[PDB]
Amino acid sequence: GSSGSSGRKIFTNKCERAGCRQREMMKLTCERCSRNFCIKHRHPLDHDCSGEGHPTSSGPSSG
Template sequence: MEFPDLGKHCSEPTCKQLDFLPITCDACKQDFCKDHFSYVGHKCPFAFKKDVQVPVCPLCNAPIPVKRGEIPDVVVGEHMDRDCTFHPGRNRNKVFTHRCSKEGCRKKEMLQLACAQCHGNFCIQHRHPLDHNCQAGSSSASRGRTSTSRAAEQKPSGVSWLAQRLRRTVK
């Protein structure tokens, strides 16, 4: 033998293979070959210290402690029956929250479809100004003007569009 001190024998009693790159088990601190380095491969008596898995409730995502010797599925089932804080009818986020502003329309949309002229929120069918009878900028005097002259006349003011809209409805 040229290198008598090189490598170590596998600590598995049935193997004892000389391994030049042995792997040390982090639980029992013994050296093993590539076939027996896993906890299951060498039946590690200290595997419970390192190989700990905590089940999580599928409903409330809470970790559920499991004592040694208990079946995790049974413990999770008991948690779901007794201690689970999840209630199916509660905590549901509404998806369709944007209601159409057109009179008589009760549709709700997932996304806000605001009109660029009157700033109202409308459904897909009423999103265009002609579909919801948009009153903003459609007076008879302004229809004959071009868009550039209308844009030149409109001066930005410090009043929000909501305040302007409320003033129009009050008059």
Template sequence: MEFPNLGEHCSEKTCKQLDFLPLKCDACEEVFCKDHIAYNRHKCSSVYKKDVQVPICPLCHAPIPVRKGETPDAVVSAHMDRDCKPDSAQQKQKIFTNKCFNPGCKKREMMKLVCDQCHQNFCLKHRHPLDHACPGQSHAISKAGYAALMRSLKSQTMTLNYQLLQNRSQAKC
């Protein structure tokens, strides 16, 4: 059994394909197949109704209205020449503003890393009290710092023990 009223032909002049699931363009209201439904594929004459872009001024960050037929670049350029008022408060601020207080270090961090003891700001490398020779009340050691201190003490005692054993063996001879 045939269905003579089922489906529609694509409105694109070069296609005219019979489509059983036709799609209607929301700008020009014509019917198209899946291959020609995009605005640029069927050269839609009413695309300006749907494809609206509002450029933003790079200096004052204000939206610039563009009328039909005007090029956005020309409108933004005219705005920058006549109406643009760059606001210094809205200008791009530097991200890395927190300078390290360790002498000789010129690094800057995005976030503040304040020492609990001396209350000064440091970079990631000098954030621990032992790393920046903190003049605070006491030298609190982090777990990593404590482990490093223990390793160094252990290696020092092992070298001392080794030297003592060598001295004793030489003394016996």
């Protein structure tokens, strides 16, 4: 039985911004978080950039 419908085509990109459905003909990835976004949210100032900002260091083993 048909379960789930996959969709992937090299035509347009999909912004990774919250409550955003902007499709930029060209691919736009941030330089800090390295995530896809729309020209509008392409800048790290018009989008909650969570790339190079949160301090992380190896500690726990589990995970």
